[PDB]
Write a protein that binds this ligand. Sequence first.
Ligand SMILES: [Zn+2]
Ligand SMILES: [Zn+2]
Lengths: 21, 21, 21, 21, 21, 21, 29, 29, 29, 29, 29, 29
Amino acid sequence: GIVEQCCASVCSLYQLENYCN
Amino acid sequence: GIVEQCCASVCSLYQLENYCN
Amino acid sequence: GIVEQCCASVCSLYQLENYCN
Amino acid sequence: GIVEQCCASVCSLYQLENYCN
Amino acid sequence: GIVEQCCASVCSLYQLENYCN
Amino acid sequence: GIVEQCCASVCSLYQLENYCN
Amino acid sequence: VNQHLCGSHLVEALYLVCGERGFFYTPKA
Amino acid sequence: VNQHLCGSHLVEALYLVCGERGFFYTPKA
Amino acid sequence: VNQHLCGSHLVEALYLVCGERGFFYTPKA
Amino acid sequence: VNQHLCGSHLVEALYLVCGERGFFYTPKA
Amino acid sequence: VNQHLCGSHLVEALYLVCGERGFFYTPKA
Amino acid sequence: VNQHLCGSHLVEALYLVCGERGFFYTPKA
Ligand SMILES: [Zn+2]
Ligand SMILES: [Zn+2]
């Protein structure tokens, strides 16, 4: 997911917001 | 500038966009 | 929480273990 | 040693303590 | 330039000063 | 030491050279 | 934009983007 | 051992300590 | 969202936000 | 000396070396 | 746990783990 | 040039400056 992806591929800060609480 | 608006102040990701070249 | 115990306070590597999921 | 290893391979914080004074 | 280089190859802090204003 | 000279104080890149082993 | 973020850099982006709210860091294992 | 760790600093101590299991950072709490 | 971002911290928020276009950091101003 | 600096690390070196003056971050695209 | 730590990240882990005590950073050359 | 550098910040200025020879960080002293 998140980590896999943000590292392996690329990820925007919008996707990142799915991680706050 | 940025420092005041952001270090003294508070600012959001929104306002940092103004310093993107 | 973590902030108080650690930013206002002081805490060791020991206490951070409590926030490891 | 330390650097070589912590980077090349893997290293735990316990091994890291051998570096303080 | 700067980024390309500092990353790809190597760069000294003297070259870096060409970036302040 | 370093902290005083640099965190309480102010110091330049020049003075950090003194702590290069 | 898009960001290529690994290890500790991943967690800074999360510290920033959620700021205030807080967050969960769950890498796959 | 025993330090003052604020803002991003604490999230970074968290990734080092925690590593693979990861963590939750719930400041509200 | 809304944080206190000082010294290097602000330059890092800048790289994440801005990414590829990059930025200018003119504190004088 | 010489430094191998990428991504956010590039920008910290710039935050430090120009400190006070400020700077422009212009990656190629 | 185990940590894969390079360059400046190596030195943060050392800043944290020894905190107070201080430390020596001696890479091979 | 001339900045306030505290905690981890100073250790990072140290790695950039010093690079390959490395350094000692003896705060006690
Ligand atoms: Zn890195
Ligand atoms: Zn800081």
